[PDB]
Amino acid sequence: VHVIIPTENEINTQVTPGEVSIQLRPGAEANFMLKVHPLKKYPVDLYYLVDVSASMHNNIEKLNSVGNDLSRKMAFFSRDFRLGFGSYVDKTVSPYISIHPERIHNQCSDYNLDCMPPHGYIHVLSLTENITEFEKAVHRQKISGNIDTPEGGFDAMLQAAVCESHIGWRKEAKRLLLVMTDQTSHLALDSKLAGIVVPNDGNCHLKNNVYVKSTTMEHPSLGQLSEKLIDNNINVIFAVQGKQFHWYKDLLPLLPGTIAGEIESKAANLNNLVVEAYQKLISEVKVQVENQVQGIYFNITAICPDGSRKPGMEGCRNVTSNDEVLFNVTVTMKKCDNYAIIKPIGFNETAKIHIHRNC
Amino acid sequence: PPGPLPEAVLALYNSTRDRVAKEVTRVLMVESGNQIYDKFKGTPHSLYMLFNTSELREAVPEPVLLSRAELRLLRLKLKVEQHVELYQKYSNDSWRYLSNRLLAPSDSPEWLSFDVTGVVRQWLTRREAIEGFRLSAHTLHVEINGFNSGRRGDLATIHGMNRPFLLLMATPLERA
Amino acid sequence: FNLDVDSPAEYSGPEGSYFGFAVDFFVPSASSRMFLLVGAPKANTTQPGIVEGGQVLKCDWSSTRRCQPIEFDATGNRDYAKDDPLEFKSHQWFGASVRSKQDKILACAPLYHWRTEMKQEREPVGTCFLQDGTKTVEYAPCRSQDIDADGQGFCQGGFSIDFTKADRVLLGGPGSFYWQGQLISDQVAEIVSKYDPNVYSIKYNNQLATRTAQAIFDDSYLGYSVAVGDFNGDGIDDFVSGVPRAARTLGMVYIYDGKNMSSLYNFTGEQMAAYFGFSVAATDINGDDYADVFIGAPLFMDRGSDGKLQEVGQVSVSLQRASGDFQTTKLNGFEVFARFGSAIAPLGDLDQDGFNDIAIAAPYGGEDKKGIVYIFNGRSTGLNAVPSQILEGQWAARSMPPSFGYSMKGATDIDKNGYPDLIVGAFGVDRAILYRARPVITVNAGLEVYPSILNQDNKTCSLPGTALKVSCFNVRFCLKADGKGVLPRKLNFQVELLLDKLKQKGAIRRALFLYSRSPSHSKNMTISRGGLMQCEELIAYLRDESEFRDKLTPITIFMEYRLDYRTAADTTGLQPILNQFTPANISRQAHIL
Ligand SMILES: *[C@@H]1O[C@H](CO)[C@@H](O[C@@H]2O[C@H](CO)[C@@H](O[C@@H]3O[C@H](CO[C@H]4O[C@H](CO)[C@@H](O)[C@H](O)[C@@H]4O)[C@@H](O)[C@H](O[C@H]4O[C@H](CO)[C@@H](O)[C@H](O)[C@@H]4O[C@H]4O[C@H](CO)[C@@H](O)[C@H](O)[C@@H]4O)[C@@H]3O)[C@H](O)[C@H]2NC(C)=O)[C@H](O)[C@H]1NC(C)=O
Ligand SMILES: *[C@@H]1O[C@H](CO)[C@@H](O[C@@H]2O[C@H](CO)[C@@H](O)[C@H](O)[C@H]2NC(C)=O)[C@H](O)[C@H]1NC(C)=O
Ligand SMILES: *[C@@H]1O[C@H](CO)[C@@H](O[C@@H]2O[C@H](CO)[C@@H](O)[C@H](O)[C@H]2NC(C)=O)[C@H](O)[C@H]1NC(C)=O
Ligand SMILES: *[C@@H]1O[C@H](CO)[C@@H](O[C@@H]2O[C@H](CO)[C@@H](O)[C@H](O)[C@H]2NC(C)=O)[C@H](O)[C@H]1NC(C)=O
Ligand SMILES: *[C@@H]1O[C@H](CO)[C@@H](O[C@@H]2O[C@H](CO)[C@@H](O)[C@H](O)[C@H]2NC(C)=O)[C@H](O)[C@H]1NC(C)=O
Ligand SMILES: *[C@@H]1O[C@H](CO)[C@@H](O)[C@H](O)[C@H]1NC(C)=O
Ligand SMILES: *[C@@H]1O[C@H](CO)[C@@H](O)[C@H](O)[C@H]1NC(C)=O
Ligand SMILES: *[C@@H]1O[C@H](CO)[C@@H](O)[C@H](O)[C@H]1NC(C)=O
Ligand SMILES: [Ca+2]
Ligand SMILES: [Ca+2]
Ligand SMILES: [Ca+2]
Ligand SMILES: [Ca+2]
Ligand SMILES: [Ca+2]
Numbered sequence A: 001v002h003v004i005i006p007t008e009n010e011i012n013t014q015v016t017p018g019e020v021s022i023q024l025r026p027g028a029e030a031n032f033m034l035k036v037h038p039l040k041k042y043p044v045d046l047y048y049l050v051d052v053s054a055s056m057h058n059n060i061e062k063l064n065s066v067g068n069d070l071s072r073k074m075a076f077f078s079r080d081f082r083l084g085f086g087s088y089v090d091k092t093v094s095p096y097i098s099i100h101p102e103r104i105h106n107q108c109s110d111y112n113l114d115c116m117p118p119h120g121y122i123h124v125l126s127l128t129e130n131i132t133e134f135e136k137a138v139h140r141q142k143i144s145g146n147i148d149t150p151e152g153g154f155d156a157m158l159q160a161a162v163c164e165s166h167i168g169w170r171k172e173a174k175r176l177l178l179v180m181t182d183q184t185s186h187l188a189l190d191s192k193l194a195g196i197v198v199p200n201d202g203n204c205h206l207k208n209n210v211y212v213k214s215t216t217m218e219h220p221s222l223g224q225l226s227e228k229l230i231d232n233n234i235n236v237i238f239a240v241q242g243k244q245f246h247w248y249k250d251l252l253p254l255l256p257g258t259i260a261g262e263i264e265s266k267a268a269n270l271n272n273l274v275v276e277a278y279q280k281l282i283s284e285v286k287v288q289v290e291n292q293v294q295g296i297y298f299n300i301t302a303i304c305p306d307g308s309r310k311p312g313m314e315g316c317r318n319v320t321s322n323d324e325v326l327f328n329v330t331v332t333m334k335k336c337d338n339y340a341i342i343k344p345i346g347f348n349e350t351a352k353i354h355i356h357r358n359c
Numbered sequence B: 001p002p003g004p005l006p007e008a009v010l011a012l013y014n015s016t017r018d019r020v021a022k023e024v025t026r027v028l029m030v031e032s033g034n035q036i037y038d039k040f041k042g043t044p045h046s047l048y049m050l051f052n053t054s055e056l057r058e059a060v061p062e063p064v065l066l067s068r069a070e071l072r073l074l075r076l077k078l079k080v081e082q083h084v085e086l087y088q089k090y091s092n093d094s095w096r097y098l099s100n101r102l103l104a105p106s107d108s109p110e111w112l113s114f115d116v117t118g119v120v121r122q123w124l125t126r127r128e129a130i131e132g133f134r135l136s137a138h139t140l141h142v143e144i145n146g147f148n149s150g151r152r153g154d155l156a157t158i159h160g161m162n163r164p165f166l167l168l169m170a171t172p173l174e175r176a
Numbered sequence C: 001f002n003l004d005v006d007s008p009a010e011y012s013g014p015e016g017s018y019f020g021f022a023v024d025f026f027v028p029s030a031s032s033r034m035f036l037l038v039g040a041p042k043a044n045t046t047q048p049g050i051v052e053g054g055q056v057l058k059c060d061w062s063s064t065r066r067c068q069p070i071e072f073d074a075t076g077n078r079d080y081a082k083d084d085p086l087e088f089k090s091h092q093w094f095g096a097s098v099r100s101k102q103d104k105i106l107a108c109a110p111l112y113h114w115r116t117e118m119k120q121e122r123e124p125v126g127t128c129f130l131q132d133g134t135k136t137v138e139y140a141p142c143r144s145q146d147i148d149a150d151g152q153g154f155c156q157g158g159f160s161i162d163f164t165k166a167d168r169v170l171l172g173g174p175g176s177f178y179w180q181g182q183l184i185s186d187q188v189a190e191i192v193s194k195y196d197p198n199v200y201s202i203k204y205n206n207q208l209a210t211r212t213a214q215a216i217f218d219d220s221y222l223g224y225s226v227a228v229g230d231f232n233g234d235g236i237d238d239f240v241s242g243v244p245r246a247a248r249t250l251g252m253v254y255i256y257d258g259k260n261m262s263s264l265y266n267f268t269g270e271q272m273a274a275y276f277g278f279s280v281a282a283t284d285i286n287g288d289d290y291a292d293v294f295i296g297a298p299l300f301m302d303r304g305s306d307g308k309l310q311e312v313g314q315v316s317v318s319l320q321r322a323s324g325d326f327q328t329t330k331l332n333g334f335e336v337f338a339r340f341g342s343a344i345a346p347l348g349d350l351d352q353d354g355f356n357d358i359a360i361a362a363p364y365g366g367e368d369k370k371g372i373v374y375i376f377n378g379r380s381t382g383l384n385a386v387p388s389q390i391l392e393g394q395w396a397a398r399s400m401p402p403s404f405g406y407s408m409k410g411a412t413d414i415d416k417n418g419y420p421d422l423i424v425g426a427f428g429v430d431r432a433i434l435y436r437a438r439p440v441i442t443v444n445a446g447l448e449v450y451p452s453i454l455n456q457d458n459k460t461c462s463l464p465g466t467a468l469k470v471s472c473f474n475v476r477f478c479l480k481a482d483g484k485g486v487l488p489r490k491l492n493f494q495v496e497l498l499l500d501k502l503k504q505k506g507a508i509r510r511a512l513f514l515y516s517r518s519p520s521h522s523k524n525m526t527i528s529r530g531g532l533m534q535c536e537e538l539i540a541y542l543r544d545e546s547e548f549r550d551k552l553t554p555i556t557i558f559m560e561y562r563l564d565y566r567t568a569a570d571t572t573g574l575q576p577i578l579n580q581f582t583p584a585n586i587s588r589q590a591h592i593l
């Protein structure tokens, strides 16, 4: 029974030791200290996932000014700031949309408006250093619509999170998925009403930058959504204008690595909301462990800057740059029968622990 | 912040050319679920259109500043025909003939316009809070955009778009 | 514990039809034979121009296993006007929900669309067909003049149905009034009598229904899933309805008075997006004569000690008490993303123990997410939280998960043996399977030793062959057994008696039977079930103190029994199972003093 910390040069800048090797016997335990040191001036990838359903027609134009102004504000929080853009509405199936031939491709037809055909999720702009391109992509964006109040937000989010090769998310960046909406989102089983009885497999299904399984697969569950967001190291910011802000706020305990705030009725805080959410997310440190090793139990306690202790993934708050947080990791073997991964949520570095054992 | 246009500006630009040294503004009708059906009701022979006089005055505050006014309605597919008449409100409780129209069997939505310059000027002068128009069949089977409250859900808000309005033209105060 | 999972009856439908999506039993009051009803919502019908209309098939059971469609609707889309269709039956999902009471079969098509007379629309109103006797009528309670989303235009009536013991039809239509949802309850007599094929909107006189409410209740989907049972002691089944997106998507279950729709009870979930109320069921699970309520919440996340949340699914089980109060406990799922609690189906008294048993599915659990059905036995204190039997799907995904356990129905005895059977759908593979319940044998095994106190010098008998005087004791045992259904009168049991086994293997046994000179003895026993215990006596002696580990020791007397399983079968080859809640290993002791 032992714990070995490699003496090799670390390949991690924030989370060390990058690798840990231990040996256990049943009834025995070993421990180590995991250190996390958040950086200043992170490269930041901000992707805008915008609700473009009819209820958002008063808000889409408010994004015409979240390009250059945001880029300037982020100059003091980031090293390299890129913007991307896409949009979502709902599943293009009955009963969520009208299927009448004269309005199926223009749900707003009855009001004599020129609305964009309804769609699930469309990727418009890959993350880019060119702010002008972002603004252009927004300025030429049309408004769509559907019938039912709830929108396919979670479905679009999953695709935005998993389709890394299409979005252009960088590993060497803080990945921020910004979701703009007003109403609540659909849940995994709501789709039964549309005759969709096939679980979301969590994979990437974009064809020509368009999600094409939106009418065959149901909405993702919160379980699946948080699983994929954490796995792809994506931090989520919910920006909600309506009273439903509170609905999203109260889902936060179920979705680790997620923050939510409110959009003002005049959308005067769109850039302030993104900046505050970013600054708040970087001050929260918590880890979780993916334990695929049978017979092994993990017990992790966070040691916070003020000397307080917080168990498991409860996390430490008010952590700054040049401020280290320690996690005391105890690993114990209970029974005879690989490795486990301990990672900070929202970080692009992990600690991999290999467990040798004998009986 | 030059470059893009806001919805209000682009919409006005297109509105002034939708029907086929002055400033132009628009005053939109009051929501039917807010005021139109609180003063009376809709009936299967007539329709009411109410406007907020204070809101109008904010755009054109004086009876001697107004140069022109038009009442704009969006007619929906009619198919065959309808003969209707438009009335002005007097003494806050009476209606009198103003003008009328023979409505064509349109296939698509179309904007109609009436010259109401004199009407608006009189209502602008009158120290009243509520002004409006009445339309009726010469029995009424022509639908126009808006005038409903049973529409909610995602399209709840766009319901108020392209609703009837007064298009007002007036002399700039600077030009006098 | 008594389902036969070794030789179940497997049925299949057309590929891609979702055969097995919805399953029920069909039992005409006096036709002598029973059928299984299996829906296939995406099946290709013979209807003139209808694509994937959906159908319900009536599957036989005895002798062979074949299924044939029921011609509830043999026509196509009726016109409203020349070259202007009234209705759209393609992709209506007929067979999505099927229920039957005696000879009355109600099958629904929740995705049926129609235009209404006012304007040329395409609204998903939903329709059902009720077949009884020799007549079939169309029931379409939401196909009225109250149209569009503000009305019943998007009702999807027939999404979920059940039957009231009073001969009423309870129908959920979750899309009504901007998805507030509506329950509609009518009479069978009115549905059949007030019928005219030339009339699209039909009024009924004895219909009960919910009404509209404030916009704050929009998108709740009331009537997503329904069940019935008496929750107020009036003798009239009341209406239980899931409302999965209610209360800030916590989910709720409502109980409405079955006579006047006055609301009686409200159950609310704890966790957002657990989708509490997805499915509901009602049955007496504790023998108290009061229906108990089972509420599924398939997306429930159960946090561990480290704060990590695992999506497992949950079922809320609440017992009804005379005071009007409910006693609620919680049953959690066992596997992540298996969606435990997505389907709940009362089995009736599966093991005939006096308490009803219930099946709860987890359609995406098990190896390769084939699907698992868990059988939970009842008892006087409420449902036993520990499952007694595990049913695993036997098919692999071809394009989608088999979803074994997606739809289940029990409490009907098809093989007529007194023990109700269970039908489980697996629509992802277009299959349905019937598991039959084995008879249960409860065994009373007796064991005595005479005397319990003896010693090495207490010479009381002589050995066979050579009359050597030895110390002795008599070993007595007896056996009785019975069941409550159809069991063979003669039960063939294998029994074995062991002496002085309480020691290290290889050690010399001191207590041996006189005739066999062995620490063990066995017999083939045939007993009459329900009769008196059959008795036998063996005589044992002790070896002297030349071969021993100690001198004063316990002598254990041990008896074990099991079934023969060669002659123990009914006329279909279905074998009985011993009660799994009783020991088949019993003991007594004698001592050397
Ligand atoms: C299980 O949980 C459900 C809720 O999920 C609960 O059912 C709800 O019961 C409440 C009543 O407690 C329903 O709310 C309203 O009830 C009034 C009846 O009068 C009461 O309330 C008024 C206050 O308004 C008091 O003064 C009075 O003394 C009573 O306490 C109804 O009249 C209401 O009807 C409205 O809707 C109708 C059409 O839908 C309208 O025609 C009618 O005019 C009302 O309109 C309202 O809203 C308008 C805006 O849209 C507004 O302009 C009007 O002025 C007015 O405010 C209404 O029914 C509630 O709807 C029930 N909800 C559901 C989903 O059924 C169960 O009782 C509970 N069960 C148990 C056992 O606890
Ligand atoms: C950022 O993107 C803008 C386009 O949004 C680029 O500007 C264009 O440059 C091309 C020449 O390559 C001209 O033909 C276009 O007319 C320009 N468009 C506009 C709107 O100015 C700009 O050069 C890009 N900048 C960088 C550094 O890549
Ligand atoms: C985690 O993110 C950090 C940046 O915040 C990555 O570190 C940078 O890697 C690039 C590689 O081209 C270097 O040029 C930078 O100088 C590094 N930054 C610092 C502050 O040292 C890090 O590599 C990411 N983790 C992984 C596993 O890729
Ligand atoms: C990290 O956790 C270990 C427990 O695994 C701590 O070790 C214990 O420290 C207390 C101090 O009061 C002793 O009484 C125990 O006997 C130690 N026990 C073990 C290994 O069983 C360790 O001190 C913690 N480190 C920090 C920095 O908090
Ligand atoms: C019911 O019949 C239709 C029509 O033949 C089937 O739909 C076709 O499926 C083939 C094979 O994938 C496609 O190449 C055709 O283009 C489809 N036609 C249409 C009109 O969609 C449908 O799959 C059949 N359904 C079942 C359950 O058998
Ligand atoms: C894990 O650590 C906490 C202290 O934060 C302690 O209370 C708890 O008992 C520990 N659990 C195990 C299983 O070691
Ligand atoms: C806690 O956060 C506040 C800002 O909200 C900051 O002013 C304060 O210094 C922080 N405390 C510590 C100990 O870092
Ligand atoms: C429904 O019936 C019960 C039982 O008689 C009665 O107490 C209740 O007041 C009735 N409610 C309505 C709305 O008729
Ligand atoms: Ca919607
Ligand atoms: Ca009752
Ligand atoms: Ca009970
Ligand atoms: Ca039982
Ligand atoms: Ca049986």
Ligand SMILES: [Mg+2]
Residues within 6 Å of the ligand: A053, A054, A055, A056, A149, A151, A183, B154
């Ligand atoms: Mg919307």
